Symmetry: C3
Subunit: 457 residues, 3 copies
């Protein structure tokens, strides 16, 4: 006997309503098996992978991850895949959870401007990745072609206050992290499993700041967590909290009371969180350079009353979250645009640099540039800075050590090099500093920094 | 009290019968503990890791993975390791599941032409990796020195229709993927965990096409799945199906109803599959560039009646499986041999290119070269191709974009670069195309391609 | 209702006594919730990451991993973080298991010479990683800022004979593995997840030889195992044994009877071992090049009577453990020091080379240099060696193959290149060989080897 043996479809055919991340369709709330018609369209389009960084994504439904599909175990799914006429590549789909060769792949092969369909019975309850299955498969997945399908148990999942949709991916650009412009896919980096970005929901900042997920103290939150890969395994973790439950795919096993859980490439899990004290809870890949150097952080922000008996401390700030503590970094997008257009102003640079200074520089120099007398020198009204802005470019790129005098006080410490910052980033940060705190004004250009990078002091 | 406390060996000594992958010895079918004599011989020998690509493997029993060993919990195992006289290196063994230092390693040290033996009690039921334990251990394991030992529970495992033996490994060649010739081991790639091949059972195609595993609709299949490493963790997955059960080593935990499962380096699992609808089910490492760019795919092919109520779609084809959809790629081996011998004919190239065109080119241009008018230009009777075969070499290596006219129709799309193809591969593919579909004939040589690669248009 | 709801703190405030690795504080042995005051001080200091290789570690409590903290579920923890005045960087803490944003991070931000404190309730039983949470977070963690906190269940853990503390980390030096001197942190290697060292407890050899963990036949051993990362996932394994139990963090799930288990980056587990036969049991990351090429091996040495019915074989030796079979490699530290001071003697080199010869060379040439006539040529009284010591440098770096005659006998085999050995290592090994076994004496210098490396034969 096959699983999901609930009899023939009954009632009326249902046209599935799909949702865009980070939202989820409502519970199916149904006691009978149905014929469910799913319509999904592939769209190839440029989007911002980071501020001022464009990428040609290939998408199911216009988003990365693709639209969320929700059905019931025992349903008959008539799956329609359309490929938008603007596409250049053919596409198809493999849904995990499908019983049949390729998960649908042969029957869903769809050239630009065409449509395909196939039918399958959802035998398997669980949360499942779906993805493109078109040669070269890794290129298609790396370009964003993945999402989740939930096959509910017949009785439905337990009710919760919120349901969200979060999916990790690894991305491979020709340029380095935060290098501006339209970035091609990089096959060599992909084969070597050396991503430039590791993201939730298709972009840096997709789920941080003003795009955070929300709930209130006392509420329950279910997150459907995918790992589209193509290549990485996520050490998936919530900072400052615990998962009540973690369940992989449709497995019988449920782990309870864990904070860190490994999600295979192509894997998916359902996690549950109970909000206990207010603040921001960070979802990360705890392979830490991914989370803190490549974009792999998302936020669940909890509103409500503090409970000092449980936690006396403060909300997260830029020391830990860096430049993602703030609502957004729109000023960086604006400055990059203005550079392209040849209209970059001092103030455009100042505002971009203000955004980028947070964490990156403020951890030591403070948000007001005051530093800490004798320990971290000031950037505010800094004689040392004013005396030689080219030296300041060298200091950011190449670090500084040894005894120095700043505003009448000796320092004898170490500023690490920050060579991973791009030329525009150094330029904008220093222009911000120069135009703040009674510093002398003026500006530093990306070309100025390019020259210092090519010939260090 | 020790585990496996079933009393002294009884009956007669048993000479274990070992099997070569992908086959498994029969169930032990025994209710008493025995003395089991195991004889395993190390052989160093060249084998084909891919078509036309030789590698010096170091093997237990002549195969990668090594011979499968099957005993019963509570048995006393007298383990004999022989090192063939032709070997250049000493070798030994560490069997996971052994209770004792090194898993046998010190007592099994065996120089070329020698034999060693040691005895251990199998206290631990489970599936276990064994491997060489000779400095430099990583070199020995990377060269193929790993296999599985099953220690059955006293009552035996439940009966199934088929049992198979599949083992992943990561391999490190000096040359790139599919670069022909005898490829040395590459220590630098190994230390960096940057394999050139990721394989099941020691070779590309070892379990695809005419070497697939088989079963019928309704049957149960147990697979003993190892990960020899040395370095990679497998996001082990079955495309288009689900695992009824996954059990690691001898663990108490059994996960049920999962599709994707993480197998540690040096780990092993027993998975169970129930065949429900016919077609090819792909075992992969779902770190996708391994599966689709490095060889990490194996096939379980199911025969029987379609069930349209469960899955209406078609069997897998080259869109998803690429050049492994076909029974084999023997023509590539033959062409490579002929190149070495200086006897390479046009037809040798044509047949090799025919094999390599599948998926790689046919996904867009179709198996008949017709393309799709206005969307993917034809290779069949292509004026554009005929007009400039050196341009065609550049197009394969370096891609093509922009408006073009082919056979009277405008195209305005993007063909990605395919620079990872080796010179012989480009040459053979283009020679196939030129000699098909009313194209003008002639040939492209590997040297022709080498020159275009050294100086792009 | 919140977990750990055991009522208000009672009794007297408790000043936690913290332990340095590999030791653990005693069981709390308490039936009431308490206020527990924890005092931890950050110290930045140079330590030896390997013999003759210094590194500037950043530490919680002077060690890597940091001091072990042990409390009871339901306790109120008043956490004090001090930053030693000698520090150059600010620091803070995120304790997994804390319920609150950042796990403590915002409220624990501490400049050099300062102190911070915050209070949290330990709601969550389990073993948990703690680490620094200061931008750039990956740099801080890579420099050693991680440890474990145990939150006991209210009834305590079951009693065992020994409890130990073992924590894996990945490290990123500018220089290659075993390159001597003070090694800077390497940001590029860190971002790429390409460590030069993978270690237990902060150094090569930290838990090998005379620093092994101990127990006796029949005893139980609990190990609190952390993975500080920052980036790697451990295929954590015990050679020659099995784990009775593995439990992650505070999870409900407990796996029993497994040998190989995946520990996420930032993860922690409690494992249990029962000693059955004497010898050395190796804890490794079974991504094997880590264990055998980067330092990721630790030893649990069991004393007591052999049981030939369970295991007839011998204790581990240098064939498997390599140069870590011996008690220590102090001679390498001494020789490196003497080179720095310009006082390096022949005997300093000889003793360093003796240490390094084990495994590395002895696997084939034997500990006495005799080789195996006709199979592995002798280094003892070797005419071939004496005839040309520059050829001998080339042989170590670049390998040797083909027919040769040594001491009147023909060999026709392959010695692999050993190019990963550093110049001082080759020099010291060859000086050892030259000064042993009736060889002619003299010495080989690091500069001699540098020249052969720059121009191979
Ligand atoms: C702590 C880890 C720091 C971070 C992050 C940044 N800086 Fe820094 N900076 C730091 C120290 C300890 C020092 C002095 C080094 C010494 O030799 O004692 C400095 C110095 C500077 C200076 C020059 C002195 C001055 O004008 O105060 C400049 C211009 C400067 N730092 C700039 C700067 C910027 C823009 C940063 C973000 C990109 C940044 N620093 C980070 C410590 C740390
Ligand atoms: C889809 C992703 C493709 C794959 C895979 C391959 N080709 Fe292609 N090719 C494709 C397009 C869209 C185009 C036109 C580009 C444009 O500027 O509009 C092409 C073009 C060619 C040509 C030249 C035109 C012609 O003769 O039709 C050649 C010779 C060609 N392609 C060859 C070729 C081969 C041999 C491939 C496998 C190695 C291959 N292509 C793959 C799209 C795609
Ligand atoms: C086995 C895998 C070996 C290891 C490890 C090392 N050596 Fe070796 N060595 C080996 C062989 C098979 C040969 C002969 C190669 C052939 O062409 O047949 C050699 C040779 C040497 C020699 C020259 C001959 C002699 O004097 O005996 C030297 C000087 C030598 N080997 C040194 C040496 C050292 C110092 C090693 C550790 C760094 C080492 N070898 C490792 C096999 C193996
Ligand atoms: Cu696609
Ligand atoms: Cu998949
Ligand atoms: Cu071997
Ligand atoms: Cu092993
Ligand atoms: Cu720190
Ligand atoms: Cu953490």
């Amino acid at each position: 006997k096959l699983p999901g043996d609930f009899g023939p479809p009954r009632g009326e055919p249902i046209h599935a309503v799909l949702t865009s991340p980070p939202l989820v369709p409502p519970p199916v709330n149904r006691t009978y098996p149905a014929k469910v018609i799913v319509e999904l369209e592939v769209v190839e389009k440029e989007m911002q992978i980071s501020e001022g960084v464009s990428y040609t994504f290939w998408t199911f439904g216009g988003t990365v991850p693709g639209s969320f599909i929700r059905v019931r175990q025992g349903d008959t799914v008539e799956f329609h895949l359309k490929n938008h006429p603007s596409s250049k590549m053919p596409h198809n789909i493999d849904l995990h959870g499908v019983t049949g060769p390729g998960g649908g792949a042969a029957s869903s092969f769809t050239a630009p401007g065409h449509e395909s369909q196939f039918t399958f019975k959802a035998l398997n309850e669980g949360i499942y990745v779906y993805h493109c299955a078109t040669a070269p498969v890794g290129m298609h997945i790396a370009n964003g072609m993945y999402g989740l399908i939930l096959v509910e148990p017949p009785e439905g999942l337990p009710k919760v206050d919120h349901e969200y949709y979060v999916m990790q991916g690894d991305f491979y650009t020709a340029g380095k992290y935060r290098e501006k412009g339209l970035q091609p896919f990089d096959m060599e980096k992909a084969i070597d499993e050396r991503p430039s970005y590791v993201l939730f929901n298709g972009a840096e900042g997709a789920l941080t700041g003003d795009k955070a997920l929300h709930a209130k103290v006392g509420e329950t939150v279910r997150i459907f967590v995918g790992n589209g890969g193509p290549n990485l395994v996520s050490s998936f973790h919530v900072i400052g909290a615990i998962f009540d439950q973690v369940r992989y795919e449709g497995g019988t096993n449920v782990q309870k009371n864990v904070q860190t859980t490994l999600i295979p490439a192509g894997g998916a899990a359902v996690v549950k969180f109970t909000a206990r004290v207010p603040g921001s809870y960070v979802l990360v890949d705890h392979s830490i350079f991914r989370a803190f150097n490549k974009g792999a952080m998302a936020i669940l922000k909890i509103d409500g009353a503090e409970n000092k008996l449980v936690y006396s401390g403060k909300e997260l700030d830029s020391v830990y979250l860096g430049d993602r503590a703030a609502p957004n970094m729109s000023a960086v997008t604006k400055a990059t645009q203005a550079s392209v257009s040849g209209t970059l102003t001092v103030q455009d640079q100042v505002q971009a640099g203000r955004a980028l200074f947070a964490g990156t520089c403020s951890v030591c120099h403070q948000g007001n540039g005051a530093g800490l007398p004798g320990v971290f020198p000031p950037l505010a009204k800094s004689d040392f800075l004013a005396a030689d802005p080219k030296r300041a470019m060298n200091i950011v790129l190449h670090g500084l050590n040894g005894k120095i005098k700043v505003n009448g006080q000796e320092y004898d410490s170490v500023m690490p090099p920050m060579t991973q910052l791009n030329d525009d980033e150094v330029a904008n940060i220093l222009t911000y500093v120069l135009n703040s705190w009674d510093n002398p004004g003026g500006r530093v250009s990306a070309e100025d920094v390019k020259k210092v990078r090519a010939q260090p002091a």
